[PDB]
């Protein structure tokens, strides 16, 4: 009930779309993944790639994490991704988010789960 791995999947995985819908993707998705139940999580990124493609990042380019840990890996190639971030005018429990679609190299922290 919630392992670090399922938390990760619940929060960032969206293999059901190749890219962000439209301007409301962050509103529905943040909602769906229950990232706004108690509060409005302020920032969250969705990866539009298959689970396996993302797990495979842990055997890609090893880099330091933004903290100094050594368990961070960078994807060799770019990935379709969606940046969800709270708009200056967002208050609980009516959380508004600005969806920003992009194609980027993701950096993930890995552990044996």
């Amino acid at each position: 009930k919630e392992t670090a791995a399922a938390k990760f999947e619940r929060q960032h995985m969206d293999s059901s779309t190749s890219a962000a819908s439209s301007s409301n993707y962050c509103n529905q998705m943040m909602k769906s993944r229950n990232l706004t139940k108690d509060r409005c999580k302020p920032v969250n990124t969705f990866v539009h790639e298959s689970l396996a493609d993302v797990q495979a990042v842990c055997s890609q380019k090893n880099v330091a994490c933004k903290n100094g840990q050594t368990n961070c890996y960078q994807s060799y190639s770019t990935m379709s991704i969606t940046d969800c971030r709270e708009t200056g005018s967002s208050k609980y429990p009516n959380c508004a988010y600005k969806t920003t679609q992009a194609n980027k190299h993701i950096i993930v922290a890995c552990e044996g789960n």
């Binding site: 990124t45 993701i106 950096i107 890995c110 552990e111 789960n113």
Partner: peptide
């Protein structure tokens, strides 16, 4: 099998 546990950054 080391799996992603945190989404650190983009690019």
């Amino acid at each position: 099998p080391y799996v992603p546990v945190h989404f650190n950054a983009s690019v």
